[PDB]
Amino acid sequence: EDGTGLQDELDVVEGMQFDRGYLSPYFINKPETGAVELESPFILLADKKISNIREMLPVLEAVAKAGKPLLIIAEDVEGEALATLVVNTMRGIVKVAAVKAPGFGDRRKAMLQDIATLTGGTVISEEIGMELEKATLEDLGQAKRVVINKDTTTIIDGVGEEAAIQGRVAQIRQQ
Amino acid sequence: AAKDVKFGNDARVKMLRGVNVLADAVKVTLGPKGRNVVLDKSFGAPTITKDGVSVAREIELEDKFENMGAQMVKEVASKANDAAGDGTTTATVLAQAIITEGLKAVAAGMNPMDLKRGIDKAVTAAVEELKALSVPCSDSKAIAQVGTISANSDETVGKLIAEAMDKVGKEGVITVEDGTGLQDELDVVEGMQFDRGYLSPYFINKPETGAVELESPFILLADKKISNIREMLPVLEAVAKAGKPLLIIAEDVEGEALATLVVNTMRGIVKVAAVKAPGFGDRRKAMLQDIATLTGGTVISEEIGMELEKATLEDLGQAKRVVINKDTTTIIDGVGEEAAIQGRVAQIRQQIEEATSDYDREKLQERVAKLAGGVAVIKVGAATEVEMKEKKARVEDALHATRAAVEEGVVAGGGVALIRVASKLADLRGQNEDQNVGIKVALRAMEAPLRQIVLNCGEEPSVVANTVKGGDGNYGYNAATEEYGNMIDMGILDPTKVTRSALQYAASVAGLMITTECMVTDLP
Amino acid sequence: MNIRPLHDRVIVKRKEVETKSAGGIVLTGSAAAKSTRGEVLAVGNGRILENGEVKPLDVKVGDIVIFNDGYGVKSEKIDNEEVLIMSESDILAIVEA
Amino acid sequence: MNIRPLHDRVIVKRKEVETKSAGGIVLTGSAAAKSTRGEVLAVGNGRILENGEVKPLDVKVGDIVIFNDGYGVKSEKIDNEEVLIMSESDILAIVEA
Ligand SMILES: Nc1ncnc2c1ncn2[C@@H]1O[C@H](COP(=O)(O)OP(=O)(O)O)[C@@H](O)[C@H]1O
Numbered sequence A: 001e002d003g004t005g006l007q008d009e010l011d012v013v014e015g016m017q018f019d020r021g022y023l024s025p026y027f028i029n030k031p032e033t034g035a036v037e038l039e040s041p042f043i044l045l046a047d048k049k050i051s052n053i054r055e056m057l058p059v060l061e062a063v064a065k066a067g068k069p070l071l072i073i074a075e076d077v078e079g080e081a082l083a084t085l086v087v088n089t090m091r092g093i094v095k096v097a098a099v100k101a102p103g104f105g106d107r108r109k110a111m112l113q114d115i116a117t118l119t120g121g122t123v124i125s126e127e128i129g130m131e132l133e134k135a136t137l138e139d140l141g142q143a144k145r146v147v148i149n150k151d152t153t154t155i156i157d158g159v160g161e162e163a164a165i166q167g168r169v170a171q172i173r174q175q
Numbered sequence B: 001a002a003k004d005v006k007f008g009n010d011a012r013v014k015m016l017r018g019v020n021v022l023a024d025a026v027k028v029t030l031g032p033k034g035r036n037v038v039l040d041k042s043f044g045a046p047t048i049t050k051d052g053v054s055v056a057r058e059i060e061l062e063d064k065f066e067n068m069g070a071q072m073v074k075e076v077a078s079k080a081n082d083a084a085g086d087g088t089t090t091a092t093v094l095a096q097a098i099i100t101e102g103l104k105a106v107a108a109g110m111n112p113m114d115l116k117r118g119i120d121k122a123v124t125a126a127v128e129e130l131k132a133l134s135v136p137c138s139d140s141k142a143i144a145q146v147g148t149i150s151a152n153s154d155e156t157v158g159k160l161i162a163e164a165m166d167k168v169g170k171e172g173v174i175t176v177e178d179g180t181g182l183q184d185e186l187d188v189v190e191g192m193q194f195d196r197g198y199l200s201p202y203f204i205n206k207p208e209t210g211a212v213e214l215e216s217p218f219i220l221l222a223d224k225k226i227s228n229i230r231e232m233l234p235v236l237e238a239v240a241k242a243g244k245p246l247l248i249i250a251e252d253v254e255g256e257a258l259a260t261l262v263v264n265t266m267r268g269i270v271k272v273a274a275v276k277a278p279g280f281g282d283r284r285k286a287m288l289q290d291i292a293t294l295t296g297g298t299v300i301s302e303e304i305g306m307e308l309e310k311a312t313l314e315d316l317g318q319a320k321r322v323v324i325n326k327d328t329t330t331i332i333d334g335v336g337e338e339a340a341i342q343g344r345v346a347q348i349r350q351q352i353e354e355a356t357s358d359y360d361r362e363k364l365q366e367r368v369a370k371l372a373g374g375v376a377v378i379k380v381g382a383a384t385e386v387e388m389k390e391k392k393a394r395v396e397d398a399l400h401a402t403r404a405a406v407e408e409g410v411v412a413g414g415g416v417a418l419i420r421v422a423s424k425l426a427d428l429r430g431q432n433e434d435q436n437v438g439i440k441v442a443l444r445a446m447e448a449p450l451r452q453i454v455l456n457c458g459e460e461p462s463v464v465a466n467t468v469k470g471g472d473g474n475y476g477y478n479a480a481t482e483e484y485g486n487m488i489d490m491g492i493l494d495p496t497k498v499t500r501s502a503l504q505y506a507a508s509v510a511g512l513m514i515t516t517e518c519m520v521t522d523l524p
Numbered sequence C, D: 001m002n003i004r005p006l007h008d009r010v011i012v013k014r015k016e017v018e019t020k021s022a023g024g025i026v027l028t029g030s031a032a033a034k035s036t037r038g039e040v041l042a043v044g045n046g047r048i049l050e051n052g053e054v055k056p057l058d059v060k061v062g063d064i065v066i067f068n069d070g071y072g073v074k075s076e077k078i079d080n081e082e083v084l085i086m087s088e089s090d091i092l093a094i095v096e097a
């Protein structure tokens, strides 16, 4: 890429990263720049837009019981869910931030399984035998930390097994 | 489509001539005795300017190959402007000297790629030298000298600019506008101000001009427009209970709220005025948090955890007083703790260090200035509209030059700093002879800015240079007074940043340009 | 100034809308939804229809009730408070204990 | 705390929606449909229409019924559970055995 300075520079990226921003500017965990660092968060992958349909509470409350941060991946999140979310985070009930999926239907849907398997989580198949509140905290993936800014979301390390990691890579051989 | 191709010397000669035309037009505007260039426009009245970058932009050549040469040299002039906004004419001159000598080296049969490396290495060494020569610019008199020198030695310009930077502060925002009168005038604004008028013309507190002054008012910030949602009365009433004036900030206020409000203000029940937010939603919402924190108030989070009725009187921000007119709303001083004000500024540090630079930083700094600094506007006097253009343009160049001098320091003017550093680099050689010649070529090109100044003054460029070289340190020739002495004493200062940038940008384009073997262009 | 309802009309007041205690410790922000619970402020004479006797309402003042919020439910301001006016038929349930 | 219905109103709750046992062994997924089956949680006093004699409802508490989910069916949340409120007339059938 074109450099700002007159000097050549090298950048190395570790782990899974993608060009996604946060839908909740309000929730910043610590560093400024909209930076969010969640420690040992639960990761949620979904196939639908979230607005007026709040019904996912037992999944969200389950997270509250844990006392751990929640990372959300879905086609979109609107202000209704975000509004409840911002206040819940503000008082420390739950530390949760939501971001939009990778981008295009065949694009983001394809990249969701690997994110889920890498973090040991389960992708919510709206299409298949799964529903909005039908899914236990078990389903959510785990990572030691995540870095979120206005333009990008990064996962430090999702906890997943090598056989699953390698296996996802192995199915990639046809790809 | 179909192409016309030139190889070697024929290509370079055409390129050079194109460059020479561009540079010759640019050179006449360099120095105290520099002369104006007039740009023609079918749209209306022609523009006359001493600014080299503007002149460079307008030059295009009939010969396709010559045009190609001019277009490439055009960028150095334009790039220099982007960095410091000044020294663009000087940068073009360096490109002129470097290119001519470089091509001459190419003619000799030397490998231009090696020549380019020599030039590039020489440039790196020259840049390091400039930093050592650079001295801090802190006092008002030195700042005035750079402003005065930038504005083609106009003493009045330097005088006014120095007053403004000291007054507004280091992070303050200074702009320039045309003047109604024939005289130059400076306007300084303190506190939090924005270009927002009042929705209710009816509510005028004391001075007429749409002027509203509220004493110890409560400030309301909202994320919604109030049409039929008049409800919020317990909040308004709480203020009525308080007996204090109310200032309202929200996306919009309809006549329904205003109608009841007007009667309330006239008979003495409450004194309340409402104004629509800064402008665009991301921008208005972004500036609302600082307004609230500055005044000690709370922004109503319609979006998050707040409602129209829900909000106590204490939530509203407090200020000593505000000033409102049809075009603008100003707060004398919101009462907020110094730590919170500074804190908003502290979060702004990410905002300041932004990849965008142009546009984002200008607006950002304006917020910052309003938050803790000051804002200054300069009006320019002149009998006619075209005179005003020239005068105003130069003032901006001085403004950019002072900003550059403050941050990176200054070096002696008259091109003395480049010629003086050249003597230092007489010891620089590299990998092979072609590079050594390239290095040598750059050193010779350094001299040119000095001699153009003298040339424009009608005097022998070479004779003045010999005495200048003969001199020591800051010694040099003052073109305006037509005599030798200490350049610093004279008051002629070159910001280090413009001088450095000119050399760097000029050489980078020149190195690649001299290495061109073949040129491709469309047929006549 | 406490209102006297006219036969078969019951005056009740609505309780808090989407109270922040559903599903557990999760706070659900209001997203433009409304609640059917309230208390009976006043009881009318009874239902007049069919002349022979006036039947008293199967409700008493101060009860906590569940009702169907519909067109038949009217809103009035009492002592700068919100009160709803509806018939016995519109009240779906009684909350006891 | 439990619910006391307001005369002729019956409080019922639905069973499961499109349970995966239709046609035999095969599992048929949810196609965005609802179920008409329910149980009677509570019984109202009865019909108060025509003044004389308030007639008791034919349906006892704890029954399993089939009903017409029409306008006269309302939804209430009791102790964080979903319940339905409708009149006796809305209920179409009783599942006994
Ligand atoms: N009175 C002067 N005497 C000697 N040198 C001067 C005088 N005024 C300006 N200069 C020098 O000549 C340069 C060109 O002036 P300027 O018009 O501002 O060109 P830029 O547009 O700066 O190339 C200055 O940067 C400065 O070093």
Ligand SMILES: [Mg+2]
Residues within 6 Å of the ligand: B086, B087, B149, B150, B151, B152, B397, B398
């Ligand atoms: Mg200048």
